[PDB]
């Protein structure tokens, strides 16, 4: 009876069927996390995790911040941790890693597939509009031709978005994509959406057509706020914006590629540098916005912070909810919205720490959910999530829509439309 680092105790069904309840237990998925969201990746007939487990991608452990990222997501020395992957092996090289920083009460469960994914009785869980947030392997069976699951359509086209940045897309991008600049669905002078005509036009253009199954995908490039446009750094999060634009036009199948461009890279798979010429259509097949709701102007947020069902979600970071910036260097005004709920969204105007993981995929989403019941950010309101001028508001309503919430929106003009008419309050410093 000795702790021992490179062999761990194995746990029942039955003993781990008693205890789903405890709140002294940690489950562990150490699947990828598009397996966690309900991706049926080796083929199981259901998807997800265990109920109540917590996601921790065996693929995080060449993270250097590894024991940093375990400890924000709570997961203590003193909670008995059990793993959990498509087989007991892949949970090896974790238990160990639990147990070099301190932790020992380790266990590794052997049979969640096919025993526990294979019996109805046997508790699961999954995001419920998971397959709008596509692993890599999805893409790359798209391209190449392969069955994949949740696809039904014959018609397809891979976006690379960006700022004004086409240096993004030409330095490496997936086969056969083609690149929007972020300018082409939204205007530079409101940063809002453009007019139904413009998306007409530039939707064909771009040869998208409603029935389109449209997959966005960006590249980080670390965005520097020393740099004229930091946003052309941060491709990821146009293509989310962009894949609201879509959406809310009316292209009725948009997927967003889990984690973007890393994502692809990192599955090894091949990357091109052509310039793919657009093949353009010449109709788009739809009025345009078909899904008007999804997007909330200035007149309706308005009435949103008087309604006692509505709220607006202010999606900025912390120096610019007390006006110590603006986050923008073409924006002047500094100061907040009154009666937003703050939903902090990480360090600056062009990262999403608290909404993403270290490889940029989605934040586990229940963590996400319970951050924003603590604020009562909750599914029975009407939810329009803003920031700046969209960007960041666009990827926190994603990830609620992601989670099937029946009424959310993105306040498209933001703090830039509400402080350029100085007849809107605004409140300044700390709470
Ligand atoms: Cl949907
Ligand atoms: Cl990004
Ligand atoms: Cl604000
Ligand atoms: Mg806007």
Redesign the pocket.
């Known amino acids: 009876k000795h702790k021992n680092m490179y062999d761990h105790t194995e746990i029942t069904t039955d003993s781990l069927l008693a205890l789903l309840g405890s709140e002294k237990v940690k489950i562990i998925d150490v699947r990828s996390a598009d397996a966690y969201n309900g991706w049926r990746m080796r083929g199981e007939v259901r998807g997800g995790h265990i109920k109540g487990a917590k996601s921790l991608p065996a693929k995080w452990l060449t993270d250097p911040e590894w024991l940093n990222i375990v400890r924000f997501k709570q997961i203590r020395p003193e909670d008995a941790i059990v793993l959990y992957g498509y087989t007991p092996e892949e949970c090896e090289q974790t238990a160990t890693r639990f147990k070099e920083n301190g932790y020992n009460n380790v266990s590794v469960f052997h049979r969640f597939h096919p025993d526990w994914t294979g019996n109805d009785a046997f508790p699961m869980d999954r995001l419920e509009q998971y397959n709008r947030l596509v692993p890599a392997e999805w893409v790359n069976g798209l391209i190449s031709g392969e069955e994949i699951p949740e696809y039904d359509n014959d018609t397809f086209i891979v976006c690379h978005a960006h700022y004004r940045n086409r240096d993004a897309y030409l330095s490496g991008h997936i086969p056969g994509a083609t690149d929007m600049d972020t300018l082409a669905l939204e205007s530079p002078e409101t940063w809002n959406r453009r007019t139904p005509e413009e998306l007409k036009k530039a939707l064909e253009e771009h040869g998208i057509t409603a029935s389109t199954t449209v997959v966005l995908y960006g590249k980080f490039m670390h965005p520097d706020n020393a740099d004229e446009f930091p946003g052309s750094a941060a491709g990821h999060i146009g293509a989310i914006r962009l894949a609201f634009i879509m959406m809310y036009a009316g292209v009725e199948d948009v997927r967003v590629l889990n984690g973007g461009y890393q994502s692809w890279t990192d599955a090894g798979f091949a990357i091109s540098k052509d310039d793919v010429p657009k093949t353009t259509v010449p109709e788009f097949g739809a009025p345009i916005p078909s899904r008007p709701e999804f997007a909330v102007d200035i007149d309706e947020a308005k009435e949103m912070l008087q309604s006692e069902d509505s709220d607006?979600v202010?999606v900025?970071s912390y120096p610019?909810?007390i006006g110590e910036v603006s986050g923008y260097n073409y924006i002047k005004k500094k100061?907040?919205?009154p009666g937003?709920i703050?939903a902090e969204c990480g360090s600056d105007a062009y990262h999403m720490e608290n909404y993403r993981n270290h490889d940029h995929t989605t934040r586990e989403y229940h963590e996400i959910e319970d951050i924003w019941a603590k604020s009562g950010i909750i599914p029975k309101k009407h939810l329009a999530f803003?920031?700046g001028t969209g960007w960041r508001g666009s990827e926190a309503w994603f990830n609620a829509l992601l989670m099937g919430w029946p009424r959310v929106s993105v306040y498209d003009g933001?703090?830039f439309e509400?402080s350029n008419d100085p007849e809107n309050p605004?409140?300044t410093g700390v709470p």
Do not use: D, H, T
């Open positions: 607006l202010c900025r610019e909810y100061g907040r919205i937003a703050f803003y920031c933001g703090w509400w605004y409140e």
